[PDB]
Write a protein that binds this DNA or RNA. Structure first.
Ligand SMILES: [Zn+2]
Lengths: 217, 129, 83, 56, 71, 132, 101, 25, 221
RNA sequence: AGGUCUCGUAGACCGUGCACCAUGAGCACGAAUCCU
RNA sequence: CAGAUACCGUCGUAGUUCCGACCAUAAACGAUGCCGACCGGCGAUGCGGCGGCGUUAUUCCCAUGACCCGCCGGGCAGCUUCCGGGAAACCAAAGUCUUUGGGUUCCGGGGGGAGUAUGGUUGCAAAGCUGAAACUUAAAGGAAUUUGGCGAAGGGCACCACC
């Protein structure tokens, strides 16, 4: 995680960070999040670091590429903001997606047909998805989380500080997470731009869907 | 009001041990704590400890690892002879293989095994295991 | 475990956490053995070296295990020294 | 798909007690009880009393 | 165990003494009233003479009359 | 009180999920389809199924419902979230930036970028709502 | 057993408060324990305000209100349906009821 | 019976016992 | 009477790639199939009933009876467990009791008293277990003394394989379910007590699921 | 010069006690385990 | 009202108010003794002090009153919690407790008899403190789940209920 002179951001990742507004956080703070946040500026918005979040993406990417079976990463989103980027991430990396209404029996009930117990649990918000962590507690399951400054830190193992409110920041950082996973896997090159689009991970309201339908072809 | 210094020091380091802290700020710096922690280092339980000295009662900084369970203080200072120490390690010590009972003597401050080897008893201080 | 002869009496020794250094019970299912990867030194890809880490259930239920894993990876040499 | 045995009478005491052991599916109401359920009621002559059997 | 001091023991003696006087078996075993109220006078057996026979009834869950003598 | 039970609703659900092309809004036509595709013991239950399939067709024709996954409406979601537009709305020529964030980007690994435009700071931090 | 964290009142570090009376009855009840109501009212309701309006000397004459403060004992509060009991888990809610209209 | 009225009848019988004490010396 | 596993751990056990439950307790996988321990512990695992207790619930028409059975299982040189199941009839009560007891067994450690000769006889150290109001304390004893306690933790320690123990109790031990759960807490805490025997840093072997997840994904879907 | 400003109209929180209302003879109840 | 020297309504002596001489009793209850050390968070609140953008006592300055953003120490309290404890209700103390010992004062051994008799003691009086025994009883009690019954409350239903 950043120990090499190749595993940093060159010029463009911080540009996408500035474009998506990932540097803006919530007003209130947590008692575990003072080290991941630089200072507190005017109008009550905490300004977060970017090197530290980059190191968290590197650590999470190392955790994903550590196992050899791509089907043993279960990624779960119940909120509608990142429910499609989970499906595109599972399409790109072979993971197991859950999108909306996580039923309370996938990890602990044996007679159900949806009986899954993988190596890795990847979740989008500990504040909203307080439910899958408590059920995944009873199995030896690590937790990769996409944490906000107001999100409580409980049953967590790697906390990636981000802005999980706007859909652009979330879809961008899932796209970068998939990009790191395919980089350490070796499917894609490390210097050649493989960028098919970052627009494939962005979710939007149906009013803007109809507006784009009428504005475009 | 502060009455026993060693009792407060061992209560603080025991509370920070059970919570899980690594660095402990002990408020006073009486020399009996220094002798106790030298016994604890040469016994091998805790690691290195600092001492901050000033023109008043300074502080103690102790680096902890997960090798201490509970250290206690017997109050008041009971008198223990060599002929009665085995009853103390029966009703106080958790096992006969380990756990050490420190005591002050005329030849210094040490554990019970050194006191049995050098054939000298004295007043009690505390225990750890 | 040993005796005056020298054989190990205990059937197995239980693991300890590399950050917590307290023992984990047989029914503590919240204790995990999380595994991370090691990168190659020129190309930036996986080779096969692992750094297995373990953490207890009490800190995981407390939720301060993430800084423990961060300190463990800093002592291992994974996270950058500037950071 | 489902059966039961219902017994009653004088069991191990002076008071009357009934035991029923059910397993599976069984339908009470409607016309389909007529051509799916066969019931036999018989009297058992014991020494302390008379005992009944209900099978469906 | 409340008082923990190296030279406070007569207070512990007085406290244990008064708290022992606040008992029931120790109250009956160390007073003359309990021994003098015993008709046997601290004896296992005693002799006597019978004056008349009295038939007393039993308790309400178990209805009977018990034959007794007045000695 | 004319409410449908779970049996007729589940039956209509599965026959409208598995059969869609050979259907219609006419009650008699899909009633005859309910004769052909499903063995039914009764006729009042048949009328219940046919009326509920007609009602669900009128519910489908205004929009999708969350009970079925029909193949005619399927892959429309995939086409609708699988497009790529020309502009990503993120590689813009303008990015609007705060002075404290400029002090952050001064200290990370850059000194000054050519896509970096500054605002003046605000005059008052009256951000929290009055609650008491 | 203990029913509330407080004791149906607002006395925490005081020990004694000045008692008042009720309005429906004359029961002497302490100030912090008594339920108090302050409702804003009109002199005439929404059926008579028109008969005030066209049958008056002055046009656009704003009608005065009725400001009165009521203090009830808890028995006459529950009996006259001022406050209603709730569940044990739902008792811990200090917010007033919402006012849609 | 609550404790208050049995305390009251105790006070009444103690008062009449004190009166018979002063009138029966 | 064949076995069709529903867990990946059960499939990997039925593929004879686990030597013993030692590494299963070492990595602390959740055991949820009762037939795995039956596959591991064979003729050396026998049991005896503790108590049959009537529990009644009052309804509109009469009283509703329901029977709970306490059973304690255990191999006589190691793992023991306790299982409680409550049902209407006694047969499925005792069947669910022995099944749930085979679900939850724990490993034990045996230590010496003063000197170190032969195989151990007693607990390594003073361990305490609490639940409800019962206080159960296990104290090491010299060789040849025998288990001395109340009779039912005495027979539970006989199932434990522990030859000698010194036991003391406080409170209502008449509640045999609470007493049995408390002494099971006292026995099961024998690994959650750090002793100077285990102070080296433990080496980390690979997880068995990590070792044979390729075989599992080539076996099932 | 135009000559009804626009957008949907919970637009019901009028009220407070409420007549007198007591008692029930005891006998009449049982607790559990596994294959050939 | 069967009875009402009770619930209700009208009068109403002492008292309710102040001065002075008295008794020292409460659900005098946080039903939780005093001091001191330690172990999580958050948001407001009252005092005194400290730092800093801006607004106002009308446009410049100074520190002030009033603010906003934060901090310190004391105090009344609030929300969540697999820190921990307990029989539970619950408690950031009712925690640091079989792994039992920081210092110290008072106080209780099943339930009645009984806070009773007598003895002492203070008071004008009422009474206050100290305070038993004989004898009788296997229960008296605390927390909580399920049907019960409310002249308790909220949604409905019934010509075996009403209009
Ligand atoms: Zn009132």
């Amino acid at each position: 995680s950043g120990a090499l002179d190749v595993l940093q951001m060159k010029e463009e990742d911080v540009l996408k960070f500035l474009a998506a507004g990932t540097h803006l956080g919530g007003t209130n703070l947590d008692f575990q999040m003072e080290q991941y946040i630089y200072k507190r500026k005017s109008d009550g918005i905490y300004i977060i670091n970017l090197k530290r979040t980059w190191e968290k993406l590197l650590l999470a990417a190392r955790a994903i590429v550590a196992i050899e079976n791509p089907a043993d990463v279960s990624v779960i989103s119940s909120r509608n903001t990142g429910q499609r980027a989970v499906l595109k991430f599972a399409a790109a990396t072979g993971a197991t997606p859950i999108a909306g209404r996580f039923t309370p029996g996938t990890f602990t009930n044996q007679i159900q047909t949806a009986f899954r117990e993988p190596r890795l649990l990847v979740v989008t918000d500990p504040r909203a998805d307080h439910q899958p962590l408590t059920e995944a507690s009873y199995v030896n399951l690590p937790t990769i989380a996409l944490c906000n400054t107001d999100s409580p830190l409980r049953y967590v193992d790697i906390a990636i500080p981000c802005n999980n409110k706007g859909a652009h920041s979330v879809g961008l950082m899932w796209w970068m997470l998939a990009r790191e996973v395919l980089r350490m896997r070796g499917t894609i090159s490390r210097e050649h731009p493989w960028e098919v689009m970052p627009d494939l991970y962005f979710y939007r309201d149906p009013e803007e869907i109809e507006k784009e339908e009428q504005a475009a072809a | 009001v502060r009455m026993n210094v060693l009792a407060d020091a061992l209560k603080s380091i025991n509370n920070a041990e059970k919570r899980g802290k690594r660095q402990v700020l002990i408020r006073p710096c009486s020399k009996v704590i220094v002798r106790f922690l030298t016994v604890m280092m040469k016994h091998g339980y805790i690691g290195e400890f600092e001492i901050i000295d000033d023109h008043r009662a300074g502080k103690i900084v102790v680096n902890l690892t997960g090798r201490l369970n509970k250290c206690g203080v017997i109050s008041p200072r009971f008198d223990v002879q060599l002929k009665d120490l085995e009853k103390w390690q029966n009703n106080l010590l958790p096992s006969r293989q380990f756990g050490f009972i420190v005591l002050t003597t005329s030849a210094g401050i040490m554990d019970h095994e050194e006191a049995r080897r050098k054939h000298t008893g004295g007043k009690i201080l505390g225990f750890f295991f | 475990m040993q005796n005056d002869a020298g054989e190990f009496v205990d059937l197995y020794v239980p693991r300890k956490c590399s950050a917590s250094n307290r023992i984990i019970g047989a029914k503590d299912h919240a204790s995990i053995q999380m595994n991370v990867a090691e990168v190659d030194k020129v190309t930036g890809r996986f080779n096969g070296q692992f750094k297995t880490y373990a953490i207890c259930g009490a800190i995981r239920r407390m939720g301060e295990s993430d800084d423990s894993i961060l300190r463990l990876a800093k002592a291992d040499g994974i996270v950058s020294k500037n950071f | 798909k489902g059966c039961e045995v219902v017994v009653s009478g004088k069991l191990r005491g002076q008071r009357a007690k009934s035991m029923k052991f059910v397993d599976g599916l069984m339908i009470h109401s409607g016309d389909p009880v007529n051509y799916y359920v066969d019931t036999a009621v018989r009297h058992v002559l014991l020494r302390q009393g008379v005992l009944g059997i209900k099978v469906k | 165990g409340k008082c923990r001091g190296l030279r406070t023991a007569r207070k512990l003696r007085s406290h244990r003494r008064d708290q022992k006087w606040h008992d029931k078996q120790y109250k009956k075993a160390h007073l003359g009233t309990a021994l003098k109220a015993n008709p046997f006078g601290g004896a296992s057996h005693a002799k006597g003479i019978v004056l008349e026979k009295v038939g007393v009834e039993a308790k309400q869950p178990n209805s009977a009359i018990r034959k007794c003598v007045r000695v | 009180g004319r409410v449908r039970t779970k049996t007729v609703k589940k039956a209509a659900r599965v026959i409208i999920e598995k059969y869609y092309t050979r259907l219609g809004n006419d009650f008699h036509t899909n009633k005859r389809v309910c004769e052909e595709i499903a063995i039914i013991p009764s006729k009042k239950l048949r009328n219940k199924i046919a009326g509920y399939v007609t009602h669900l067709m009128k519910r489908i024709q205004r929009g999708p419902v969350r009970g079925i996954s029909i193949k005619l409406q399927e892959e429309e979601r995939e086409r609708r979230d699988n497009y790529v537009p020309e502009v990503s709305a993120l590689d813009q020529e303008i990015i609007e930036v705060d002075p404290d964030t400029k002090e952050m980007l001064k200290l990370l690994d850059f000194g000054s970028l050519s896509n970096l435009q500054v605002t003046q700071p605000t005059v008052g931090m009256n951000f929290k709502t009055p609650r008491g | 057993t203990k029913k509330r964290r407080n004791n149906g009142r607002a006395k925490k570090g005081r020990g004694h408060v000045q008692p008042i009376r009720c309005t429906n009855c004359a029961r002497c009840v302490p100030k912090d324990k008594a339920i108090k109501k302050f409702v804003i009212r009109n002199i005439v309701e929404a059926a008579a305000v028109r008969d005030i309006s066209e049958a008056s000397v002055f046009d656009a004459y704003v009608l005065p209100k009725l400001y009165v403060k009521l203090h009830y004992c808890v028995s006459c509060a529950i009996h006259s349906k001022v406050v209603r009991n709730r569940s044990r888990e739902a008792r811990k809610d200090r917010t007033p009821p919402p006012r849609f209209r | 019976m609550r404790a208050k009225w049995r305390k009251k009848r105790m006070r009444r019988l103690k008062r009449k016992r004190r009166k018979m004490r002063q009138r029966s010396k | 009477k064949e076995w069709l596993p529903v867990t990946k751990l059960g499939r990997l056990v039925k593929d004879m790639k686990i030597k013993s439950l030692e590494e299963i307790y070492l990595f602390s996988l959740p055991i949820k199939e009762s037939e795995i321990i039956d596959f591991f512990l064979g003729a050396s695992l026998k049991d005896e009933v503790l108590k049959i207790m009537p529990v009644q619930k009052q309804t509109r028409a009469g009283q509703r009876t329901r029977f709970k059975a306490f059973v304690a299982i255990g191999d006589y040189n190691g793992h023991v467990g306790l299982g409680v199941k409550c049902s209407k009839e006694v047969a499925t009560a005792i069947r669910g009791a022995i099944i749930l007891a085979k679900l939850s067994i724990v490993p034990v450690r045996r230590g010496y008293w003063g000197n170190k000769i032969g195989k151990p006889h007693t607990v390594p150290c003073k361990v305490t277990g609490r639940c409800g109001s019962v206080l159960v304390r296990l104290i090491p004893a010299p060789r040849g003394t025998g288990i001395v306690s109340a009779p039912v933790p005495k027979k539970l320690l006989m199932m434990a394989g522990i030859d000698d123990c010194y036991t003391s109790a406080r409170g209502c031990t008449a509640t045999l379910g609470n007493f049995a759960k408390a002494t099971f807490d006292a026995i099961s805490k024998t690994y959650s007590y750090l002793t100077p025997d285990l102070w080296k840093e433990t080496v980390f072997t690979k997880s068995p699921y990590q070792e044979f997840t390729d075989h599992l994904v080539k076996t099932h879907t």
